[PDB]
Amino acid sequence: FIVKATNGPRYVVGCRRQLDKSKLKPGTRVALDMTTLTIMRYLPREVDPLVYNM
Amino acid sequence: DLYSRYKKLQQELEFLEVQEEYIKDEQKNLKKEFLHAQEEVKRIQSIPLVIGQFL
């Protein structure tokens, strides 16, 4: 999975075990491993604070 | 000397053939080592592949 840190450089790593690559495609928000940067958990996208304000 | 020179022709061909043999088992050994190398070529790597760019 060719990635870039949302606030850093770019890398290519894999998922943990069962993050369900089925729905996981370029664009969805994921988490990364502390050690190997590997994907540990994907999660829903942001909510952009101002939306909660409205 | 037919009972010396001719006979002396084997005084070294034995070690000759022994080393000609050993070259085969050492082909085997070096093949083992080359397979080890090819193994170690790409086993730690390609998992945390960071991305830059050629310049």
User: Is there a contact between A25 and A2 (Cβ–Cβ < 8 Å)?
Assistant: no
Q: Which of A1, A10, A34 to mutate to test the interface with B (most CBs of B within 10 A)?
A: A10
| Closest partner CB to B48 (pick from A2, A4, A11) | A11
| Closest partner CB to B51 (pick from A11, A14, A36) | A11
- The technique by which this structure was obtained is cryo-EM
Contacts of A16 (CB under 8 A, 6+ apart): A33, A38, A39, A40, A41
**Residue in this structure with the two tokens 């037919």, named with its chain if needed:** B2
E strand or H helix that includes residue B39: helix B13-41
**What resolution in angstrom units was achieved for this structure?**
5.7
Q: How many CB pairs under 8 A join A and B?
A: 23
Per 3-state DSSP, what percentage of chain A is helix, strand, and coil (rounded to 5)?
5, 35, 60
Contacts of A32 (CB under 8 A, 6+ apart): A3, A5, A13, A38, A39, A40
Residue A46, Ramachandran bin (φ over 0: left; ψ between -120 and 50: alpha; else beta): beta
